[PDB]
Design a protein around this ligand. Structure first.
Ligand SMILES: [Zn+2]
Ligand SMILES: [Zn+2]
Length: 67
RNA sequence: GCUGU
RNA sequence: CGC
RNA sequence: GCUGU
């Protein structure tokens, strides 16, 4: 559960659904995208409510993208 | 740099 | 979010 | 049971 696929329409500035209603990740630009399968690394601490980093390297998925 | 019960 |  | 460019 540590990888999520990025929204292509978000990446080309084009998501009419918006982050809340989109089934794909809308990550921050500082988060590294694996260009081979267009995914981002999920913050596993965040899934458990235990990420306290001021600037985390990984994606914090909204609840609708999880479990 | 986290993922393991 | 062209398979 | 359809929603996705
Ligand atoms: Zn989107
Ligand atoms: Zn985090």
């Amino acid at each position: 559960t540590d990888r999520l696929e990025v929204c292509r329409e978000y990446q080309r500035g084009n998501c009419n659904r918006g982050e809340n209603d989109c089934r794909f990740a809308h990550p921050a630009d500082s988060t590294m995208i694996d260009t081979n399968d267009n995914t981002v690394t999920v913050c596993m601490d965040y899934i458990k409510g235990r990420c306290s980093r001021e600037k985390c390297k990984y994606f914090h998925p909204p609840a609708h993208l999880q479990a």
